[PDB]
C-alpha cells in the first residue's frame, strides 16, 4: 500500500521540520532491532552465511549488516 | 527589529557594485544587510500565497461495498459472466474454485467463478497542481533605529508589507523617509514548480512531488469527476477472500489515512483552508539601495543624562541590545554611542542601528551592537562622561570562525546553488564556485538520491572506506570529498 | 436567427430523473460551449455545469457530485441535461447558455472571458417541478 | 467557493435618477464579471461583459467599472423599463458564482 | 544576448493585444519592454542546455 515508500529521499528540504521531525529513523531502527531482537536464529544463519561467502572481514560485515536489514 | 531571537539570522556585509547585493531569504529565517551607510535593514519573509490551483487527482481513502453480485458457471464449459460487471463502477474478479453434483452442476471440476462489488467512497486526497503565476511572495523589509514597541513583533505596522510575484518586476518599496528599496526577485528558480503537488486531506495539506504522487497507489481518478465515480485501479483496495474451496467475498480494506501518514513523512506540511497559505520554501533576491538616506544626519550630538530602562540582553553571538531612555531637552538628537576598550581607547566594535535617532521625546529608544569576544565597556553619554556599562562577550575568534564554518557547511546543505549566490559582489570566484557546485551536485543530483537517512551513511561509510584503499591517488576525490559531502550532508538531512 | 430552445415544463416524482433537452439555431454549433444553470424561486440564480458539443467533455460544481450526466446529439445540435436522484429542492428553472470556446474542450478562463453566463442567446427556460 | 457579494439588496428611485450597484470578491477577478438584468418571470438580457463594457443593443444609459475586488454598475437615467433584478457574476475559478440580486422599484 | 522571433513588431490602431515570440537562452533571462521609466521587466529560466 503505502505502508512504505515513505517519501525520503527526493529532495525537497527547508530549514524547518518536515513531518514527523527525526521520529521516523529512530522508528525504522527500533523496528529493525526489535525484530533481530525477537528472531534470533536468522540471525545466526546470516552469521554463518557472512562467514562462508565473501571470507575478507570487511565483505563479511558489509553483508551480514545487509542480510539483517533485509527483512521488509 | 522583527528580527531578533529568531536566531539563524544571516548576516550580510557590502553593498559594493554601486548598489546590488544578493541574499537568499525562506520562511525560516530572516536577513539583516549591512554597509557603510545606507542603514541597515531587515528582510523576514512571510506567507506564500499560490492564489489559482487546479484539481489533479482524486484517490479514495474509506470505501464501501454494495449490492455483492457473484456468479459461477460449470466445470470447464463456460467462464462466468455477469450483467453487473458492464459498468466499471463495480469492482469485478475471476477465481476458480469447484464444482460438482453436490454443488449441483455436473462433470467434477475446478469451475471457475466471478465477484463484482459496487463501489462507493468516503473522504478523498483532493491534489492540486499550480503554475509558476498566480502566487506572491510577501515580504516585510523592516529598519532599525529605534520606534520602540518590540524589536520582535512582525505584526505591526512599520515594516512595509510589499509583494511580489513573477508577473511582476524590480519591486520598488517605499519607507518613512529614506527607505526607498528596490527588489528583484526570481522567483522561477525558488522551489521550481511544475514539480510540486499540493495535497489536501480532511483538513491539512502537504507539499510532495509529483512523480511520487502520481506513481502512489490507494486508486486513481481523474479532476474530471463530477458525475464519475469511475475509479481506474482497485486492486491496491478492497481485497477478496477465498477460503479453500467455496464461494468467495469481498473486503474492504479500510481507511488509509494513517498509512497515507507514514507515507507522506518526510515532505513539509501547509495549512490550506482560505485559498492557499503556503509556507517554508526560499526566493532569491537582487537588492538595490541608491535612494537611501539614513535618516538624517543633519543633526547635533546629543547633549547628555541617558538612561537605561531594559537589560544587557545578549542575543545569539553578539547582537546585544539595550533599550536607553533620553531625558533631557534633545529636540530630538542622535546618540553618541561608542563600543570601546579601557584605558588608552583603542575603541572596537560594530553598532548594528546605523546612525541611532530619539524620537520626539521621552520614549525608550533602543540599539543593537556586536562587541569584540571579551571584556568592553559599551558608552553612550558624553560631556560628564555620562554612562559606561561593563560587558563581556565569552565567545572566541577561533569558535566564531568555527561557527561561521558550520553555517556554510548548513548552507551547502539544504538551500542548494543559491546558497553560492548568497553572497555578493564576487565577480569570477563566486560566479565559478556556483558554476561548479551546479554542475556538481547534478551529478550528485537524482543521480544517487531518494535514498534515506540510515542508507546514506552507510553508502558514505562504505565509498570511504573504499577511498580509504588509496590506489593511485584517487583517494582525494573519493574519500575525503566524497566522505565529508556524504557524512555532512547525511547527518544534516531529514530535518 | 441567433437562438436556443429549450423544452416545455416538468413535473417529476422524488427521487426519479428528468431530462431537459436545449436546442440550437443560428450558428455552427461546434462553436460554443453549453452550460447549465438553475435558479430556486426564492433564490438567485445557481450553476449546475458545462458540456462541450465538439467531443462532448463535461464537468459540473460540487453541489451536484454524481447526480448530473450531460450527452448530446450533435446531427440534431442539441443537448440533454439529465439531473437524478431527484428531491424537493430541484423545483427550479433551468437555464442552458453558450460559451465563447477555447477551440478544443472544457470551461476555460484564461482565454479573455466566457462572455455571458447566461443571457444573451439562452432560450425561453425549463420549469421543473418535484412533487408527488 | 469564491464568494461574490452584491450591494444593495433593494432599492427605490424615480424616474431619470442615476443609481450605482457594489460587488465585492473575496479573491482577486481583475476583470472577470458581467452584469445583467432580469425581468421577473420574463426572458432576461445581458448588460455589461468585462466590467467595463457595453453589449451592442444595449442603450448607452448603463455602465460599470472597477478592478480590484469591488465593482460599480451604474445606470445614468433611470427608466420605467429599467425594473428588474440585477445580477453581478465572477467568471473566474470555476465554482462558478452570482451574485444575490439587487431588485428595482420605481417611484 | 537572446534572439527575437516577430523582427519588428509593431502595434496596430490602438488597444489591440499584441504578441511576441521570442528565444531565451538556456538559463536565466530578463525579458523586457519598456523604455523611459524602464516600464517593465520579466524573469524567465528556460531549464535547457
Ligand atoms: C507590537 O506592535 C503592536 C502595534 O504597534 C503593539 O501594540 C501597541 O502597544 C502600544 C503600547 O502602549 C499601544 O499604545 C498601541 O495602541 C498598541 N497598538 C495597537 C493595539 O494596535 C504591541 O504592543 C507590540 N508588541 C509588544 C510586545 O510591545
Ligand atoms: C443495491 O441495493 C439497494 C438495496 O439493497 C437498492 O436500492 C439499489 O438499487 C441496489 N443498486 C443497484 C445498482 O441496483
Known amino acids: 500500500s503505502v505502508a512504505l515508500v515513505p517519501h525520503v529521499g527526493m529532495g525537497l528540504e527547508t530549514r524547518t521540520e518536515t513531518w514527523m521531525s527525526s521520529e521516523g529513523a529512530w522508528k525504522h531502527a527500533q523496528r529493525i532491532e526489535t525484530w533481530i531482537l525477537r528472531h534470533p536464529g536468522f540471525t545466526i544463519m546470516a552469521a554463518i552465511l557472512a562467514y562462508t561467502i565473501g571470507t575478507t572481514y570487511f565483505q563479511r560485515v558489509l553483508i551480514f549488516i545487509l542480510l539483517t536489514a533485509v527483512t521488509p | 527589529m522583527r528580527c531578533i531571537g529568531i536566531s539563524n539570522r544571516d548576516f550580510v556585509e557590502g553593498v559594493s557594485g554601486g548598489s546590488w547585493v544578493d541574499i537568499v531569504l525562506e520562511h525560516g529565517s530572516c536577513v539583516t544587510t549591512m554597509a557603510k551607510n545606507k542603514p541597515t535593514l531587515d528582510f523576514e519573509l512571510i506567507k506564500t500565497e499560490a492564489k489559482h490551483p487546479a484539481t489533479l487527482r482524486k484517490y479514495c481513502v474509506e470505501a464501501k461495498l454494495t449490492n455483492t453480485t457473484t456468479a459461477s458457471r460449470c466445470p470447464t464449459q463456460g467462464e462466468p459472466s455477469l450483467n453487473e460487471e458492464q459498468d466499471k463502477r463495480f469492482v469485478c474478479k475471476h477465481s476458480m474454485v469447484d464444482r460438482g453434483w453436490g454443488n449441483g452442476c455436473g462433470l467434477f471440476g475446478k469451475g471457475g467463478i466471478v465477484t463484482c462489488a459496487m463501489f462507493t467512497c468516503k473522504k478523498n486526497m483532493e491534489g492540486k497542481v499550480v503554475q509558476p503565476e498566480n502566487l506572491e511572495y510577501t515580504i516585510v523589509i523592516t529598519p532599525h533605529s529605534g520606534e520602540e514597541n518590540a524589536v520582535g513583533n512582525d505584526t505591526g505596522k512599520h515594516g512595509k508589507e510589499i509583494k511580489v510575484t513573477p508577473q511582476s518586476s524590480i519591486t520598488e518599496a517605499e519607507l518613512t523617509g529614506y527607505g526607498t528599496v528596490t527588489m528583484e526577485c526570481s522567483p522561477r528558480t525558488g522551489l521550481d514548480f511544475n514539480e510540486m503537488v499540493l495535497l489536501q486531506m480532511e483538513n491539512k495539506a502537504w507539499l510532495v512531488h509529483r512523480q511520487w504522487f502520481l506513481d502512489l497507489p490507494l486508486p486513481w481518478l481523474p479532476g474530471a469527476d463530477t458525475q464519475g465515480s469511475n475509479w481506474i485501479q482497485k486492486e491496491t483496495l478492497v481485497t477478496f477472500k477465498n477460503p479453500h474451496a467455496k464461494k468467495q467475498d469481498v473486503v474492504v480494506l479500510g481507511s488509509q489515512e494513517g498509512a497515507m501518514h507514514t507515507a507522506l513523512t518526510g515532505a513539509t506540511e501547509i495549512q490550506m483552508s482560505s485559498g492557499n497559505l503556503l509556507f517554508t520554501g526560499h526566493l532569491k533576491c537582487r537588492l538595490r539601495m541608491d535612494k537611501l538616506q539614513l535618516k538624517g544626519m543633519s543633526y547635533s550630538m546629543c547633549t547628555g543624562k541617558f538612561k537605561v530602562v531594559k537589560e544587557i540582553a545578549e542575543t545569539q553571538h553578539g547582537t546585544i541590545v539595550i533599550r536607553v531612555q533620553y531625558e533631557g531637552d534633545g529636540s530630538p538628537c542622535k546618540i553618541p554611542f561608542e563600543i570601546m576598550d579601557l584605558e588608552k581607547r583603542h575603541v572596537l566594535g560594530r553598532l548594528i542601528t546605523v546612525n541611532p535617532i530619539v524620537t520626539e521625546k521621552d520614549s525608550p529608544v533602543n540599539i543593537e551592537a556586536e562587541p569584540p569576544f571579551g571584556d568592553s565597556y559599551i558608552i553612550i553619554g558624553v560631556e560628564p562622561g555620562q554612562l559606561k556599562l561593563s560587558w563581556f562577550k565569552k565567545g572566541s575568534s577561533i569558535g566564531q570562525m568555527f561557527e561561521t564554518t558550520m553555517r556554510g557547511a548548513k548552507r551547502m546543505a539544504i538551500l542548494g546553488d543559491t546558497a553560492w549566490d548568497f553572497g555578493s559582489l564576487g565577480g569570477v570566484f563566486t560566479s565559478i564556485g556556483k558554476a561548479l557546485h551546479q554542475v556538481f551536485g547534478a551529478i550528485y543530483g537524482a543521480a544517487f538520491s531518494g535514498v534515506s537517512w540510515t542508507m546514506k551513511i552507510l553508502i558514505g561509510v562504505v565509498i570511504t572506506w573504499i577511498g580509504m584503499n588509496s590506489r593511485s591517488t584517487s583517494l582525494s576525490v573519493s574519500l575525503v570529498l566524497v566522505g565529508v559531502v556524504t557524512l555532512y550532508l547525511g547527518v544534516m538531512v531529514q530535518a | 436567427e441567433v437562438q436556443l430552445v429549450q423544452s416545455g415544463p416538468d413535473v417529476e416524482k422524488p427521487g426519479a430523473s428528468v431530462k431537459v433537452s436545449c436546442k440550437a439555431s443560428?450558428?455552427?454549433?461546434?462553436?460554443?460551449?453549453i452550460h447549465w444553470v438553475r435558479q430556486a424561486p426564492g433564490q438567485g440564480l445557481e450553476w449546475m455545469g458545462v458540456?462541450?458539443?465538439?467531443?462532448?467533455?463535461?464537468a459540473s460544481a460540487q453541489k451536484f457530485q454524481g447526480r448530473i450526466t450531460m450527452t448530446r446529439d450533435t446531427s440534431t445540435s442539441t443537448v440533454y441535461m439529465e439531473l437524478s436522484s431527484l428531491r424537493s429542492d430541484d423545483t427550479a428553472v433551468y437555464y442552458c447558455?453558450?460559451?465563447?470556446?477555447?477551440?478544443?474542450?472544457?470551461?476555460?478562463?484564461?482565454?479573455?472571458?466566457?462572455?455571458?453566463?447566461?443571457?444573451?442567446?439562452w432560450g425561453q427556460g425549463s420549469l421543473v417541478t418535484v412533487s408527488s | 467557493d469564491i464568494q461574490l457579494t452584491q450591494s444593495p439588496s433593494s432599492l427605490s428611485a424615480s424616474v431619470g435618477d442615476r443609481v450605482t450597484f457594489t460587488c465585492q470578491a473575496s479573491?482577486?477577478?481583475?476583470?472577470?464579471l458581467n452584469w445583467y438584468q432580469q425581468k421577473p418571470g420574463k426572458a432576461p438580457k445581458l448588460l455589461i461583459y468585462?466590467?467595463?463594457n457595453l453589449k451592442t443593443g444595449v442603450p448607452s444609459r448603463f455602465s460599470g467599472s472597477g478592478s480590484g475586488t469591488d465593482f460599480t454598475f451604474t445606470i445614468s437615467s433611470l427608466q420605467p423599463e429599467d425594473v428588474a433584478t440585477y445580477y453581478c457574476?465572477?467568471?473566474?475559478?470555476?465554482?462558478?458564482?452570482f451574485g444575490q440580486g439587487t431588485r428595482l422599484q420605481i417611484k | 544576448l537572446g534572439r527575437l522571433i516577430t523582427v519588428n513588431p509593431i502595434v496596430t490602431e490602438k488597444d489591440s493585444p499584441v504578441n511576441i515570440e521570442a528565444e531565451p537562452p538556456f538559463g536565466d533571462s530578463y525579458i523586457i519592454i519598456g523604455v523611459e521609466p524602464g516600464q517593465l521587466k520579466l524573469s524567465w529560466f528556460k531549464k535547457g542546455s
Open positions: 447558455a453558450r460559451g465563447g470556446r477555447a477551440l478544443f474542450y472544457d470551461s476555460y478562463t484564461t482565454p479573455r472571458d466566457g462572455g455571458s453566463w447566461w443571457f444573451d442567446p
Open positions: 443560428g450558428y455552427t454549433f461546434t462553436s460554443n460551449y
Open positions: 458540456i462541450n458539443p465538439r467531443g462532448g467533455s463535461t
Open positions: 479573491q482577486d477577478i481583475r476583470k472577470y
Open positions: 468585462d466590467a467595463s
Open positions: 457574476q465572477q467568471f473566474d475559478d470555476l465554482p462558478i458564482t
